[PDB]
Design an enzyme around this catalytic site. Structure first.
Site, short mmCIF file in Angstrom:
data_model
loop_
_atom_site.label_atom_id
_atom_site.label_comp_id
_atom_site.label_asym_id
_atom_site.label_seq_id
_atom_site.Cartn_x
_atom_site.Cartn_y
_atom_site.Cartn_z
N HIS D 169 0.99 -1.31 -0.06
CA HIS D 169 -0.06 -0.08 0.15
C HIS D 169 0.68 1.14 -0.05
O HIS D 169 0.65 2.13 0.62
CB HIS D 169 -0.97 0.08 1.12
N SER D 287 31.46 13.77 -15.78
CA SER D 287 30.25 13.64 -16.39
C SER D 287 30.00 12.21 -16.83
O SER D 287 28.99 11.43 -16.34
CB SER D 287 29.84 14.55 -17.70
#
Lengths: 448, 448, 448, 448
Positions: D169, D287
């Site tokens: 849930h 990067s």
């Protein structure tokens, strides 16, 4: 790709039947509408006094932009496709194309930073799709449905007075006329057809997540809600003020459901015509003088395509109307299929029109059936009995009808044994099944 | 039968949640509405000058008929059930009951032959169902949806200014406010809710096959089309002039599709609330002072029931709208299930209202997420760059964002390196994710 | 709640038709099966040597537990309902009930800590539902479908040799026999009926998220995978080794789709029988000696209910098979409706059986149609022509059939003009439509 | 037609993704398979001793026929299209083509009357479609699904031991491993994938209405049932002995439903992966060294296409399985769309494979979440308590968990206050969320 090797019959077997939709739903159409939207946005900024950084466009600049739209072709679409090589977003390729074109105009050369100003990709896409839907419906779908309605109406008018045995639960019932039965379908089509014409297609224009954030960052002083409302409403669309990144697609669901309603009436029609053909109520119109069966293939083709169209339209209405949080991208690929659903509908409409043109009434088949079913007058006798306060009118006729095979003779004999005015008897003795059609023909004449 | 042994959870587990619908959809309701329709028909004949064979009803007769409706109960329903022993048609049992009752009034005693005069069973049934639908929507469904809309609106208003990180494709995006995200759902609900209120439920009244045949046989001189139109419109329904034995049920399809549209928006809502709970954006409102998780069970219950309701509503719209020739009877049993579809909806609405009342905003969860995602300001920087005609504004920010993890410091540093007015720099250096919500709060305040 | 006031016709109008399903699908059934599962789990722990902390159960203890199941009633169900007052989970109320009962047995008094040992609620629920499905199919659904198959088979056998005009696209075609047409439906039913019987209903038993975490925390030394597999397989179910908190419900989808396949064949059947009745091929069996129409209402009732059942079964297969991450709870409420889908099916089966018993063949209707359609022999002539290498056999018969209305005389005349052996001519001149049924009767006799 | 102007994205945007299906589903494929079927039928007659009127085929004749199939191309397809100008039936155009070709062979020149001998068009069409389905599944669909299964399995194996917080849930629950969660989907796929491989596609071959009428007229002495069974089974199909003009399409429904089951599991997968990406559990692999978000677009594209595919497959299973009496033609046009449904599936599979290849695990995100949720160990403590017969083990832990924010410290403190063996305490004090994964990794290793 040739039509022979296409997987979908929309672009294959039925390629000639569906071409009218290509200018509205196709990768080419989507590119055309994105381009139009980007240019019209840029123009809206030039037209706004509170945005002096984009000067008002002069004659030559307006015409240059105008010409980009009217001169758009495969060549230019391919050029935009070229730019897709560089980008995450397809819509960005359109901005790149425009940056390129703006170089060719002294005034526009200077304004390139304002192409796609404060927009998100979905601002452009939702408008493009809104216009594709709006125009496909206005130019192709609504007029074709209008034609089908006229076709069935003409058949209804022609056969207004042609008496016919009804069938309820498949079995002989109170008579009607062929034209009345046909007009019933057109009567059902009127409401959703008008609804289809009247729906203003929803569209939004408000940045990344619906709040004009980037607009307000750069121009806190511009009334962006007013600007964007006027922009969208200028295009003949329904401005949605309240959205996330996407327009929530409930308008697409509404249009899909209108199409479903129309298709289901036409599904019912194709199935009844097939039954009337089966009964020999229609024959082929076109050895030249001899009666021949009409093959109901066009109605069967329409029947199959109407179901396929509904399958997709139902799916659109259910699936497009959820999107996770400020949106998930699973609707994008689904939107590329709106045209497919309209195409199955269009093929079906063409088939209905084509089948309708083959029908010639077969009066002798209709008359044979009436003349064999005098039992259908029973309710007339019963209701006349009621008028003159005769007590067990229903039970009496059930006792009659279940105990003998009814014809003119037994009916006359029964009528005479009733205690009703002599004039009342006389009128009932005149009745025949082919003359017990009530207000069928009057209702057909009244129909428009 | 007890609720423990019921097969359907509508009359079992959820029996208390669905009782409001029992007076509209149940064998008892159907009997009540058939009785009402038969009496109101009889009254319409008494009220017609061109039908002098039924005299105008006097004070005492009107009250007697009136009392049959207001005093209708289980006892009386059982009495009508008693007469079903004799009949092919259930509706006929109502006529028998009325024949019986008419004996108790001097004036009515005489008029028994005019009960169910010229009617077919389906004349009575379609009106009965039209009234059941009309009233269930007017008294129960439309007001409950109005309540859900108010509930979500109140939550939206309360959290109008609560900044929140957006998620597009699940990932950090341009901020919004919690209240704006909630108001978006109410905005979607407005149109189909108004459409639900405004639909006039179609109904017909025209004899065995739609042509007033039996009416015209007994009373050629009475304007039956006018009489029946006025009868049906007097009940607050939409008169259908053009039908076979059945009303063609396209109005039921339209109502079913409106319900589908509403349910799908609410489906989307239950799924988003579940996600906001998952993110900890909401906690339980109600150790007393300590934060606790809210269990999203009510939204999950609504989610399940909304899908069940749509399954049936979609089926109704597709199946009820075909019927073979002048009709087949397969729609009868299906109509007994309209209430089941509305019931799944109603259970879902009650669950949404109940879940909504448990939500308390968790500001610190929302703030943590904003403060961790400074990258979402990039578009603000880019769009300010555009305003001052800076060329590669998008590429520059992509080069920035993809090369470092962005915070306040790197942003300030980047901003300073831009060629934009000093005032423009200063305003961008003031920006924070929690203050980059655009017009979210303004749009919430404007919402009604 | 009375059947009169029930909203669903399952527990209302059709309450007597659906009671067989109440012991499998109802809040009472769900309680019974949860109780059974909890007790059988506890017993499995007592039966395991590596879990000495639960001693082997003695005669008296086994009988006590056994008696809890066989003596379970409304009173006891209400007692479990009493405990739901205290709990978040309904299943927990069963544990509380059992804790209470264990006090009444000297040996069990001591073992209360092992009730629901290491279980999650869904361990109990999925098994309970698996058993409800398994048993409803084994005791009610599969045997009822077997009965419908036998009913249609008997009709097929009885009418094995009754010649009948075929209709393809609604129009006269090559003859068959009534019994052959009926047997075709039973042939279609065989495969999915066998598939329905053979599906082992999936079930899992593995703790909170599928990994036996709590089991392993307390008993690292017990082979839990082996224990739980043996537990589930002992119940006649299909053990699923790989799950989250829920069993993923793909088995429910498979069963739902088998039911859909069965229902669609029966839908096709009800529609064809309705057409055969419409053609007068069947009349009512039961003035005593006079032919009377059969009302196809039972087939129309089955038709409506089969569609409703499919609407729900299709929904189950699509919706239950997604659940967010380690599960969302939206499937719970949906599972309470499995019985509703089976109930619509059951009502439909009862209606088919009831309609079938009303059918009497009407030979003269069938013979009239054959004797009016000699054109259907054309393919026989053509194919005999082919055998003797006659070139344009198809075109020649098309030229014949399209130029005159064919009867015995024109056919004989055409046959004589052919260049085929004299014996070949003679055999074709003997042919009549009622004797051109091919292997129809042979195929019926061969059918089992 | 170009891909730019195509209406359907199958032959447009996604033309390169769907080409593998063109040889199976396209007007060209249908022509190829009809041609193959006609030739193989003719060969079956030559091969039958009881049909001496067609002589056994010699080396040169076999090769000529063989070459017609292997040399079939666009040119030849166009030639068959040429003959459609003359015919009511498309299949007839193939017979005409073959008549033409048979002239080029001394032996075949003589046997033209036996092309399409005793066949109906639907004999050829149903076999052609059966082979198209069989081969599309064997060569394209089943192998692609096998690839997707392998892809997810590889990811599961790689992340077998990567601890992860569960969410039930939406909320923190008992831990699992990423690889276990992935393997769960492959486990679900196994059964329907095997079912897809094993289905023998139904086909019939029995003349106009299913009774071999024309066969028996010309050759009463040939065992046609045996001949046709052997013919159909020689092609690797499932012979249907019991049909009308059409094969009843229940096998198409079965295959459609298997595809639906597969697609729904994959739908569930795309939605969970999207959630795991949203949680940062996966990042882009590519990067150069810095962590970057993965865009879930491929999973969103798969999600959209899986729904479209199911929309059509569900429709096929429902609509194709009714056909009026000995058949109506509305299935014909629908069958031309089988490829469209498989194409949406195929596009989705390609997208899943493509997205899967972008995923790199982000261990620190997974570890952060575990380390923040010590409350998930509660059930371990409770279940150890049960083992040593501690009475209110569940209530005690609820009292603990609801009254304080749980970490290592409070847990240790609580554990010490329990009356359990010292060794039991010590083992619980060693437990951490990342080490409470139960048998997750063991189950992954065991998986195949």
């Amino acid at each position: 790709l040739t039509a022979l090797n296409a997987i979908s019959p929309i672009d294959g077997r039925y390629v000639n039947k569906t071409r009218a939709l290509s200018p509205y739903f196709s990768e080419f159409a989507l590119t055309y509408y994105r381009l139009m939207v980007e240019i019209k946005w840029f123009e809206s900024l030039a037209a706004n006094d509170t945005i002096p950084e984009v000067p008002a466009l002069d004659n030559k600049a307006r015409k240059f932009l105008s010409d980009l739209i009217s001169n758009f072709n495969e060549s230019e679409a391919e050029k935009i496709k070229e730019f897709e090589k560089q980008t995450n977003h397809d819509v960005k390729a359109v901005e790149y194309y425009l940056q390129d074109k703006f170089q060719e105009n002294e005034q526009l050369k200077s304004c390139v930073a304002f192409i796609h100003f404060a927009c998100t990709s979905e601002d452009i896409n939702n408008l493009a799709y809104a216009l594709m839907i709006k125009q496909a419906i206005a130019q192709v779908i609504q007029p074709t449905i209008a034609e089908i309605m006229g076709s069935i109406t003409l058949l209804g008018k022609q056969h207004a007075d042609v008496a016919m045995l009804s069938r309820t639960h498949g079995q002989p019932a109170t008579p009607t006329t062929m034209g009345k039965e046909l007009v019933n379908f057109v009567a059902r089509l009127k409401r959703p057809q008008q609804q289809l014409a009247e729906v203003l297609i929803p569209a939004k224009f408000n940045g990344a997540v619906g709040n004009y954030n980037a607009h307000v960052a750069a121009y806190p002083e511009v009334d962006w809600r007013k600007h964007c409302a006027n922009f969208v409403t200028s295009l003949g669309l329904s401005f949605n003020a309240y959205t996330t990144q996407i327009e929530p697609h409930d308008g697409i669901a509404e249009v899909s459901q209108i199409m479903v309603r129309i298709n289901n009436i036409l599904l019912d029609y194709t199935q009844d015509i097939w039954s009337y053909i089966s009964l020999g109520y229609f024959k082929q119109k076109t050895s030249s003088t001899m009666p021949h069966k009409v093959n109901p293939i066009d109605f069967e083709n329409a029947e199959g395509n109407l179901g396929l169209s509904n399958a997709l339209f139902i799916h659109f209405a259910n699936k497009l109307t959820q999107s996770r949080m400020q949106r998930d991208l699973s609707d994008s690929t689904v939107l590329r299929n709106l045209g497919v659903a309209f195409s199955y509908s269009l093929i079906a409409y063409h088939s209905v029109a084509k089948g309708n043109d083959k029908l010639q009434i077969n009066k002798s088949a209709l008359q044979k059936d009436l003349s064999e079913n005098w039992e259908v007058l029973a309710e007339a006798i019963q209701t006349v009995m009621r008028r003159y306060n005769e007590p067990n009118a229903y039970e009496q006729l059930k006792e009659l009808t279940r105990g003998q095979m009814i014809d003119a003779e037994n009916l006359k004999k029964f009528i005479k044994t009733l205690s009703i005015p002599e004039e009342a008897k006389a009128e009932l003795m005149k009745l025949t099944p082919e003359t017990y059609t009530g207000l069928a023909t009057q209702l057909v004449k009244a129909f428009s």
